[PDB]
Amino acid sequence: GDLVGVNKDSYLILETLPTEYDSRVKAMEVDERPTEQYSDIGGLDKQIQELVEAIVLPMNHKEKFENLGIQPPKGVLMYGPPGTGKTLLARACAAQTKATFLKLAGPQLVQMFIGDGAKLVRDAFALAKEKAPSIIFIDELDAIGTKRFDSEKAGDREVQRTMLELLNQLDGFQPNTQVKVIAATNRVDILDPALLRSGRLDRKIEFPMPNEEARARIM
Amino acid sequence: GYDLSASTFSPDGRVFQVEYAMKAVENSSTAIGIRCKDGVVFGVEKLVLSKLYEEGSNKRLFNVDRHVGMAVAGLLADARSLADIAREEASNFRSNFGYNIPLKHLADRVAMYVHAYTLYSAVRPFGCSFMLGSYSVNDGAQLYMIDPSGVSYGYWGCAIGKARQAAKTEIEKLQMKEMTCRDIVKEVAKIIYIVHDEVKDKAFELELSWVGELTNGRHEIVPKDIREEAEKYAKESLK
Amino acid sequence: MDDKALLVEVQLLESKTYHALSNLPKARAALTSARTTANAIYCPPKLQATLDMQSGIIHAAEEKDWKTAYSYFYEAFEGYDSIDSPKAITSLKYMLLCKIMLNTPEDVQALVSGKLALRYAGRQTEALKCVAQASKNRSLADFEKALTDYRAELRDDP
Amino acid sequence: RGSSAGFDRHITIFSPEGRLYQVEYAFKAINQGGLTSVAVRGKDCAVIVTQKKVPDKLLDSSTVTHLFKITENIGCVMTGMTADSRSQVQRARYEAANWKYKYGYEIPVDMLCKRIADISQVYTQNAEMRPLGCCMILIGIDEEQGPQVYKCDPAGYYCGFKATAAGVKQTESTSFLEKKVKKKFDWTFEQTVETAITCLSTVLSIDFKPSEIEVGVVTVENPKFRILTEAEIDAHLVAL
Amino acid sequence: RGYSFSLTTFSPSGKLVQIEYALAAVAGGAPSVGIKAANGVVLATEKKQKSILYDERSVHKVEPITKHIGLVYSGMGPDYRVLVHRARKLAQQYYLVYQEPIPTAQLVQRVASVMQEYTQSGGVRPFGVSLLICGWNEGRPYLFQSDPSGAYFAWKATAMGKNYVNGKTFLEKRYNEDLELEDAIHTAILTLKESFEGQMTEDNIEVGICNEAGFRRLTPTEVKDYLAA
Amino acid sequence: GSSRLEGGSGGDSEVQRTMLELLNQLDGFEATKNIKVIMATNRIDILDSAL
Amino acid sequence: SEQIRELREVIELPLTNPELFQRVGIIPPKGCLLYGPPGTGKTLLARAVASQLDCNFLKVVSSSIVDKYIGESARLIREMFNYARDHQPCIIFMDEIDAI
Amino acid sequence: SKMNLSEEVDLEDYVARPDKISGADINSICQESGMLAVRENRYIVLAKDFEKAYKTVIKKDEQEHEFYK
Amino acid sequence: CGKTMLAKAVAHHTTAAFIRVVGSEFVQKYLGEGPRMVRDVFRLAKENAPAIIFIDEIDAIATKRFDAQT
Amino acid sequence: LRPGRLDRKIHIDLPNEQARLDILKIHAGPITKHGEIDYEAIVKLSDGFNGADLRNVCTEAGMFAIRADHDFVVQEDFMKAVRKVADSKKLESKLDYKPV
Amino acid sequence: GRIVKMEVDYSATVDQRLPECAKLAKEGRLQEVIETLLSLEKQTRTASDMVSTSRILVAVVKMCYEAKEWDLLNENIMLLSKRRSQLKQAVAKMVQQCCTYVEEITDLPIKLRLIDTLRMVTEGKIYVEIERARLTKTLATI
Amino acid sequence: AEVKGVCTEAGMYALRERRVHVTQEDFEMAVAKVMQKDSEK
Numbered sequence A: 001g002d003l004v005g006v007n008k009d010s011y012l013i014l015e016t017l018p019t020e021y022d023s024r025v026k027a028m029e030v031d032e033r034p035t036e037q038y039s040d041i042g043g044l045d046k047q048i049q050e051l052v053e054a055i056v057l058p059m060n061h062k063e064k065f066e067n068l069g070i071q072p073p074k075g076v077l078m079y080g081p082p083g084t085g086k087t088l089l090a091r092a093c094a095a096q097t098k099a100t101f102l103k104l105a106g107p108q109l110v111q112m113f114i115g116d117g118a119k120l121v122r123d124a125f126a127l128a129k130e131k132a133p134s135i136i137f138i139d140e141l142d143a144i145g146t147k148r149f150d151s152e153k154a155g156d157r158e159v160q161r162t163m164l165e166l167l168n169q170l171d172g173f174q175p176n177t178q179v180k181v182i183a184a185t186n187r188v189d190i191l192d193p194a195l196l197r198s199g200r201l202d203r204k205i206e207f208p209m210p211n212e213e214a215r216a217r218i219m
Numbered sequence B: 001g002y003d004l005s006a007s008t009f010s011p012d013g014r015v016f017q018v019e020y021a022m023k024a025v026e027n028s029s030t031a032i033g034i035r036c037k038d039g040v041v042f043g044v045e046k047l048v049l050s051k052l053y054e055e056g057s058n059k060r061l062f063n064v065d066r067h068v069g070m071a072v073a074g075l076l077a078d079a080r081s082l083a084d085i086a087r088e089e090a091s092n093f094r095s096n097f098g099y100n101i102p103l104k105h106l107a108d109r110v111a112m113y114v115h116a117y118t119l120y121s122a123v124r125p126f127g128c129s130f131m132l133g134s135y136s137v138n139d140g141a142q143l144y145m146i147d148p149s150g151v152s153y154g155y156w157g158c159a160i161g162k163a164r165q166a167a168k169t170e171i172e173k174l175q176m177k178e179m180t181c182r183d184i185v186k187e188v189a190k191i192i193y194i195v196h197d198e199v200k201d202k203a204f205e206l207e208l209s210w211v212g213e214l215t216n217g218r219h220e221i222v223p224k225d226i227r228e229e230a231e232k233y234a235k236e237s238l239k
Numbered sequence C: 001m002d003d004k005a006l007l008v009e010v011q012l013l014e015s016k017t018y019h020a021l022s023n024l025p026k027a028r029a030a031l032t033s034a035r036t037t038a039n040a041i042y043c044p045p046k047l048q049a050t051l052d053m054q055s056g057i058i059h060a061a062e063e064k065d066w067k068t069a070y071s072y073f074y075e076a077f078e079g080y081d082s083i084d085s086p087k088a089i090t091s092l093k094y095m096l097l098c099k100i101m102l103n104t105p106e107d108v109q110a111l112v113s114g115k116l117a118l119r120y121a122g123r124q125t126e127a128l129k130c131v132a133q134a135s136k137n138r139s140l141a142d143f144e145k146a147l148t149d150y151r152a153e154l155r156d157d158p
Numbered sequence D: 001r002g003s004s005a006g007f008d009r010h011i012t013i014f015s016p017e018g019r020l021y022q023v024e025y026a027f028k029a030i031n032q033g034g035l036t037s038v039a040v041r042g043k044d045c046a047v048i049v050t051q052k053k054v055p056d057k058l059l060d061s062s063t064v065t066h067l068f069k070i071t072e073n074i075g076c077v078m079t080g081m082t083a084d085s086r087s088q089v090q091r092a093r094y095e096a097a098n099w100k101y102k103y104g105y106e107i108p109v110d111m112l113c114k115r116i117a118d119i120s121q122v123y124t125q126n127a128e129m130r131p132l133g134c135c136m137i138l139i140g141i142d143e144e145q146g147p148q149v150y151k152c153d154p155a156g157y158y159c160g161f162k163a164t165a166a167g168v169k170q171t172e173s174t175s176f177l178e179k180k181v182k183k184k185f186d187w188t189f190e191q192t193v194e195t196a197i198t199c200l201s202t203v204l205s206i207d208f209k210p211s212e213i214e215v216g217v218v219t220v221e222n223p224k225f226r227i228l229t230e231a232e233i234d235a236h237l238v239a240l
Numbered sequence E: 001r002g003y004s005f006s007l008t009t010f011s012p013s014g015k016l017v018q019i020e021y022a023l024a025a026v027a028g029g030a031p032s033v034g035i036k037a038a039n040g041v042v043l044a045t046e047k048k049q050k051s052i053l054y055d056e057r058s059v060h061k062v063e064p065i066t067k068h069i070g071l072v073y074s075g076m077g078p079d080y081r082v083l084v085h086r087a088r089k090l091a092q093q094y095y096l097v098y099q100e101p102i103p104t105a106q107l108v109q110r111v112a113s114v115m116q117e118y119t120q121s122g123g124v125r126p127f128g129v130s131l132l133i134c135g136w137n138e139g140r141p142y143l144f145q146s147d148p149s150g151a152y153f154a155w156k157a158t159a160m161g162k163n164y165v166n167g168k169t170f171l172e173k174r175y176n177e178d179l180e181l182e183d184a185i186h187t188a189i190l191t192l193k194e195s196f197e198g199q200m201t202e203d204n205i206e207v208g209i210c211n212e213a214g215f216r217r218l219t220p221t222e223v224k225d226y227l228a229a
Numbered sequence F: 001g002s003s004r005l006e007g008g009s010g011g012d013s014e015v016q017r018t019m020l021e022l023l024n025q026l027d028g029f030e031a032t033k034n035i036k037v038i039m040a041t042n043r044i045d046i047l048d049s050a051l
Numbered sequence G: 001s002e003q004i005r006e007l008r009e010v011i012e013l014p015l016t017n018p019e020l021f022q023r024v025g026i027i028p029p030k031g032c033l034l035y036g037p038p039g040t041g042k043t044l045l046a047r048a049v050a051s052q053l054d055c056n057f058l059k060v061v062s063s064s065i066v067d068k069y070i071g072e073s074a075r076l077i078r079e080m081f082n083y084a085r086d087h088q089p090c091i092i093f094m095d096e097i098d099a100i
Numbered sequence H: 001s002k003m004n005l006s007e008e009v010d011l012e013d014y015v016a017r018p019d020k021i022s023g024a025d026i027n028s029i030c031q032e033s034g035m036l037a038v039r040e041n042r043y044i045v046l047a048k049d050f051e052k053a054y055k056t057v058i059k060k061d062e063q064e065h066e067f068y069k
Numbered sequence I: 001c002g003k004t005m006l007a008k009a010v011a012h013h014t015t016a017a018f019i020r021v022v023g024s025e026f027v028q029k030y031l032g033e034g035p036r037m038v039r040d041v042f043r044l045a046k047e048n049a050p051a052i053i054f055i056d057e058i059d060a061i062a063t064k065r066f067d068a069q070t
Numbered sequence J: 001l002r003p004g005r006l007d008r009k010i011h012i013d014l015p016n017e018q019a020r021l022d023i024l025k026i027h028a029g030p031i032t033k034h035g036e037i038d039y040e041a042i043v044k045l046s047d048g049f050n051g052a053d054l055r056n057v058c059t060e061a062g063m064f065a066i067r068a069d070h071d072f073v074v075q076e077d078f079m080k081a082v083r084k085v086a087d088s089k090k091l092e093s094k095l096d097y098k099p100v
Numbered sequence K: 001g002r003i004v005k006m007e008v009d010y011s012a013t014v015d016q017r018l019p020e021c022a023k024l025a026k027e028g029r030l031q032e033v034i035e036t037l038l039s040l041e042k043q044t045r046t047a048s049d050m051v052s053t054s055r056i057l058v059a060v061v062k063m064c065y066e067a068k069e070w071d072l073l074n075e076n077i078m079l080l081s082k083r084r085s086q087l088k089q090a091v092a093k094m095v096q097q098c099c100t101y102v103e104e105i106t107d108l109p110i111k112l113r114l115i116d117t118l119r120m121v122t123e124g125k126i127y128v129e130i131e132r133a134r135l136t137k138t139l140a141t142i
Numbered sequence L: 001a002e003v004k005g006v007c008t009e010a011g012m013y014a015l016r017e018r019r020v021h022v023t024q025e026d027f028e029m030a031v032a033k034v035m036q037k038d039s040e041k
């Protein structure tokens, strides 16, 4: 399965090229880090900490978890009303961290041809593993995480396979433990029950509207 | 759209209007109640939305009868309406049968009244949960809770509102079986102060009531001296 | 009334009686009508077996084609097996004879020796067994002795 | 075979195939509680056994119960929504008292089941009110008919039974009771309570303790409805 | 406090959809048969309980109304119980007023008028049941059918429920005008046997008769004795 | 005649909408007057109000 | 515990003592479907036999076998069993099967 | 026919139910029925074995709702 | 219900050649090869005149819906 | 799903009361615990915890312990994580979805 | 098959017990020796002790031998073969000891009780444990 | 078609016997199958 170059006329292996990734998957790796300090976010203090201690701290203090023998939590789902600060924390957490920040999207893993969606998910996780500690952010998870649906006379399973490949890639037949997954959603009722397990995205944070003081700092 | 009326079942067999009513009470300040050998004690975390309200305004502790208390959580209008209904039921029972209404009977009657509002599209489920407490020599201490669905159960200790889970966890360490109301008042103050969230809530005032042998079977607000002692104990605890 | 279950049985009886009087042209008509009516019942568990046996006799009686008679008698055995001893043995006797008249006496050995038939071994099977062996030996003297010794089932079946 | 047309799934009106979807959904609602109940009838006894889950130590074990006494000689176990069950129990008690006042003798179990079934029918026919998501199993002793077991569902079906169950594990316990009844007699002694507990343990695979199941008994010798205490339940369990 | 608007309305092509759906529910019900002999009437049904636990004698489908009238159904049982109760009340009212047993035709008319009310009244659905009324008044047998729509017809022989078209064809082929009650019972049992899917026993079916003596539901022993054929 | 008797999905028939398109052209805007159409149907009471 | 014993009755037993089932006359079952709520032990159980046993064990995502080419999706299944047929005692653990 | 089987086993009792099992659960019933025998190391299949097989192969659905008839 | 099994039997007690195909086998990557493969089966079935051709799971080759862009 | 292709259909389900206790030991074993860590308490309060939130309970408990700079896990931390996982479970859709 | 963690050895408990039962049987308390043993094994069966179950199982078979309780031997042979599945090899040892009984004892009732052991194995609760024992056993009838 | 199902089936019924002529019985027995036996459903 390795990629090897071959002489054009007398076919013969000459070099072993580096593994190739889909051009789409390489364009989702952030190179210009966003500039948004944690002090920019207001009100979400009990939730910003809960994320930094599940996606950033376990990446710099590995000596601490291994001392107590607790596998670090896998995944952080962020849900809440339309606009509360979900993407601000993700963008901010992409600034105070010296690690790859593979930035996925929602509608984007969806592709017309059969199996093209799986490629962009397997390739989006192999690339993160191929690099140093990485955080893979999947924003707008509704488009690829709608609840599975039984039916005859037409339906939609092309998108469902992409989700099924995301499910197994996150936690299935392989205990990958260096790629951290952050997900953003504003409608958790529609998500497939399989995507809200404990092995998959684990720390399901609730982002509430500012009450009476967050609106003061927010301004 | 299967959650527009209380008279329509969900395909999975649920009445969604009752669930929404339950969610309404979950967004209110916590109100706990503890039963002891002597009697029962009730505490309510009263959020002070603004400094313009007179202390004691929007009281959430009611006296449905001289021997039965009432602590409410949820929509205060429905809570007051159900308090009025409980008062009416107790008065009717006294007039007809000639003695104080047993707490279990009153809880069952009020629960059935609440349940009657969870069957028709002409009415909406009550958005309030509440607990009744009473003490009598013949019957002893009792404590019941009624939810929007109309479920009545007897509790040794219960909490209703936002911090129900935390309050229940903290109550579980109280070994309330062999304690008196005096210690329970301080314990209730400490529990209310522990569950309260200062970051979310600006400030709050502690409201307490009790009914037991010490009160000769009469439900009444705790004397201000005991309230101050309990509050000081709560502050000392959070050191 | 649309009661065809007993119509075939009564019609079969009429088919048999005409044969007893030895009026083949009318006997055929009765059996044909029974066959047509019998084709309206989904589960005639025994009439189908008895109807097939009657059809075989008329075929053999007309001396038209003995290969077809064996086919009809085969169905009679299949439906008659393990469920009706009193009349099932009659199928074996006619089965064995149907093969002898085909100038293929060898096959008679196989049918009797088969595991499906060993349950029904009896004097009748040896009755046609001796005649079946007689034909293979192609000796008339064997046939005569095989007839008088087993005469109870040679010159007594109508 | 699930066609719909209009408000078939919102109010009690006929579906194009002749199904009342609201009643079916109500049947689905009796499983929300998560409890299961088993009732078995013997030669001279009738027994009920139902789960008793105390989720937290704070609840008072006395109040959390699903066995109720309609009259002295009638008892019921309710499965489903608790409030609806209590409402139906109150209705049953009112009906029994009214029957005693009017006709001058105690309610036969079948008549009470029929009355409750009629009320449930009225609910399923009118579109103003929803069916009650509860199911009750009555026991009693008849003067000239022996022990009785009856079960009325939200639809309005009230057929009598020899052994019956209602809840999440209705089907498995029903198969178990069918096997037992076909075997010899479906229990033929006051130790029929052994049969019920064995069935419940088989379906729920629990190996109960005294404070995990509640039993109610009506016997010909002592027709008064009883609720066996922890000691008696423990004795029966240890016997098994 | 109760919807005041009819839930049954005329569809654009002129049919009442609710009544059609009620008839479909009836067709989904259990088989039933009624044969009018020259000296009585017979009603038969099926009672295959889902399992052995069910008590066969606990509830009955062939329920008497008065001393000379009985009925059977095919559809929803609870609706049949409600209709039985209303029919008994109507019969007793007629008896009190006129001091004579309600004729079968009159009870049919009253029950049908009761059914029609539910296809026009507010906040109600049609009864999902069809009845077969039998009686003996004026020295002649009577057999009637009444559908959810409120229409009633007079029958010499009929069948409802599952495979009712096949049963009606069977009856048309087998019926005779000059039958007796016993032959009618045998014919009805045979008609039930056409679509039964199982072994018929005394407890699996129900039979009722109506002759000069009056109406009475046959005991299991008599049903078994008839079942011998 | 044996399926789709009741409601639910279905609706119209893409053998009936064909003429309504076809017959609408052979009745006017069509030059060659040598083309003619036909149906075979088991029911004439279920035909649309237009045909 | 009971589930493992049931699953081992169609993976291990028929591949170690085939003479047992030739006695009764039954042919050991071929397939096995491990369903249940989303989060019980299904993949963990499958990996258990993957780590144990001494037979070829094909592990497939059940969704990485489909590609956009006209016939490549089907060909990957013909080879999967062709390899299984060539290499005897083999177990083909197709993972989540709602995809293919 | 190819199985061992014992005298006490009565096939009629099994082909009596209203269930619709076409051709595979019939083989599955026999397959699993004998499968049970190997569990206790037996080379006959008893009536106690078939009973445990039918309940794990046909798994009849709750389709009924007896209030409809 | 026992469809393939009967064909399994016919291939056994048959005095004519039997040719087995699977419906999904007829569609392959190389464009224009499928029609040739389907044509070879019938051609080969003609040389041995008495023969039976089985096309199992024909649902994968004959379906009404056909979107003529993919 | 026809017998012959997928003959046996295992039904791995949510752990029962006895099983639930067994689950905790395996994933709560290798933890730097201190004190009478009671596994009986966690089981009663965890109904419906399929197979991972039980392991989440253990991992989450360490998260509470890691806060407060503790190489020190106690029973209260284990309890403090049992509710935090139960709270994050109401947003699932508890459906059976069995084959047919 | 299943290896249970070693906590207590149950051999000693029966070691001082089985010989004690012998004394009671010798005096003439044939019953009292019998019913006591079964309760002894039942506890072992729950623990599923191969060695413990086998040794005790033969004792009741062995004791009935000298006791000359032929009528009580047959009834005792059946009750010990279908209680709780026993231990598969546990019944295997029992038939072996009982197997030597038939080969040595003369007189008619051997055949009368011979068939009893044939049915105890018959073709249920059979195979490598009690398979070959059946083959010789039917040969003796031959 | 129920008519052009009696002629064709009549020939088939003349084949099960191994005959070369179609007789009156074959046609009469054909209507039994196509119509009489197939009348139900």
Ligand SMILES: Nc1ncnc2c1ncn2[C@@H]1O[C@H](COP(=O)(O)OP(=O)(O)OP(=O)(O)O)[C@@H](O)[C@H]1O
Pocket (backbone or CB within 6 Å): A171, A172, A197, A199, G037, G038, G039, G040, G041, G042, G043, G044, G045, G096, J023, J026, J027, J050, J051, J052, J055
């Ligand atoms: N009995 C058990 N013992 C230990 N861990 C268990 C058990 N049951 C479930 N788990 C936990 O479940 C987690 C995931 O299990 P697994 O992926 O096999 O389940 P699943 O979600 O049903 O699988 P899939 O989605 O791949 O079909 C594992 O990390 C494991 O810790």
Ligand SMILES: Nc1ncnc2c1ncn2[C@@H]1O[C@H](COP(=O)(O)OP(=O)(O)OP(=O)(O)O)[C@@H](O)[C@H]1O
Pocket (backbone or CB within 6 Å): H022, H023, H024, H027, I001, I002, I003, I004, I005, I006, J002, J004
């Ligand atoms: N009457 C029967 N006698 C014996 N076995 C049968 C019978 N009917 C079905 N089977 C069993 O059915 C199994 C599958 O049958 P077969 O291979 O013919 O598939 P099929 O039913 O045609 O499948 P599909 O329709 O899915 O293609 C066989 O293993 C066979 O044992």
Ligand SMILES: Nc1ncnc2c1ncn2[C@@H]1O[C@H](COP(=O)(O)OP(=O)(O)O)[C@@H](O)[C@H]1O
Pocket (backbone or CB within 6 Å): A040, A041, A042, A043, A044, A081, A082, A083, A084, A085, A086, A087, A088, A184, A186, A214, A217, A218
């Ligand atoms: N606590 C906050 N402090 C400051 N800005 C906020 C806060 N919460 C939300 N915002 C504003 O919301 C915008 C981001 O919206 P976001 O929450 O990412 O939408 P969604 O929740 O749909 O992803 C930012 O422009 C930011 O200014």
Ligand SMILES: [Mg+2]
Pocket (backbone or CB within 6 Å): G037, G038, G039, G040, G042, G043
């Ligand atoms: Mg899973």
